[PDB]
């Protein structure tokens, strides 16, 4: 019953700029980006922050630029394990960085990074 | 920073509306939260968007539950103070919109989550 | 309706069941997760249903992980006051069921997060 914090990211993934065609596509352009970041912030601090990503679409209204039925994202997770970082401050700074990277690279005009404070039980 | 997410559980009931994919039922419940997002902004100025996710849910198939899992939909979203003054309103909002659409849906049953977060808007 | 929900994240073991898509990965963990839910519901009265996504998850190569991410699934549930009466013994039967699965799905690890909400049931 440790408890600690877990994120999540909603990240677009600009079509129109790597011309990605299905959801399986912008699902390995987004986790390979993470995969890149999250491994270079690990070389500098020693803390590497995994993420769950999911394929979603994201409901707005047309007139700020939505699609009909939803925009393509990807929802990134993850979550602060005891086991492999000591100082969940630093974790969440991380985090933040990695958002702001990821919000960069994929060329979005804006990115939401939530925290959530959660539970976490770890079996292995 | 601190605010409210929801999360929204909801059937896409294949026997009324014949879709035949995951994918054509996530643009399903895309469509009818675009609209009834819309019809409340026009009423109130409070426009609640979501990010929808594929899913299936599994129970009990004794209560109806399919072999392979009911086919559903995951809704989710979060009230953002720079289009929300009032995070109060944004929930009474949500609920009110989750009702709807458990009526547009024709679902017997629905969930609609409230969770504390802390939204990081960069822009 | 204060309450918890839970989330589990399993890898899907390509190299012991011999599968491909996501779709069939959800096909696979629902329906061992209807089994052993089912056993537990047996013992205890308490049935966990579970809300199952597509996912892949990305840490470091160096660690095993496939270039992009590996597959994996994500579960969800929330204790819902209509069928459980006590929140601590819902907890302790997803705790139960979360090792059963990662044992089921051959799996090293397994994650299992509790998670505070308010749920509001419409029926
Ligand atoms: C789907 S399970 C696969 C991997 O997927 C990641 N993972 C699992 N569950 C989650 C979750 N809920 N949210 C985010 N990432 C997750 C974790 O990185 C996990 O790694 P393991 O715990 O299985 O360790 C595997 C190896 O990798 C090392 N390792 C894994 N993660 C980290 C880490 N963050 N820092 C340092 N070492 C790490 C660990 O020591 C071990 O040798
Ligand atoms: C995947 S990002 C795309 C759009 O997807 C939606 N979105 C992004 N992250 C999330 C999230 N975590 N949960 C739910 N919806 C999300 C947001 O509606 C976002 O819009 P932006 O913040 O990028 O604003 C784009 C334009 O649209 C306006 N706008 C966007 N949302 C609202 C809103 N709710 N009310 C009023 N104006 C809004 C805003 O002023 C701007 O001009
Ligand atoms: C996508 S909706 C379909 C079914 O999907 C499951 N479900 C719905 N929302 C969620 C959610 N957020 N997280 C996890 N599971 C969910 C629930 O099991 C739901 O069942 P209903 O509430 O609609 O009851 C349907 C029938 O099944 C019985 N039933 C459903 N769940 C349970 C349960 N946990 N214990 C006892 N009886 C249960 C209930 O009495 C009724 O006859």
Redesign the interface.
């Known amino acids: 019953m440790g408890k600690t914090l ?1 994120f ?1 990211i ?1 990240s677009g993934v600009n079509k129109g700029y790597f011309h990605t065609n299905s959801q399986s596509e912008s ?3 987004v ?2 980006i ?2 890149k970041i ?2 270079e912030e ?1 070389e500098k601090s020693n803390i ?1 922050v ?13 007139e700020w630029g ?1 699609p ?3 925009e393509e ?1 990807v ?1 990134l997770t993850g ?1 602060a ?1 005891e086991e492999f970082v000591d100082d969940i401050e630093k974790w969440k700074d991380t985090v ?1 960085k990695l ?2 990277e990821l ?1 960069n690279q994929m060329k979005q ?16």
């Open positions: 877990r999540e909603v699902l390995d352009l986790g390979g993470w995969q999250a491994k690990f590497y995994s993420a769950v990503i999911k394929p979603s679409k994201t409901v707005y209204n047309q939505c009909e039925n939803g994202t929802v979550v394990n933040i958002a702001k919000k005009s804006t990115l939401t990074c939530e925290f959530i404070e959660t539970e976490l039980h770890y079996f292995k």
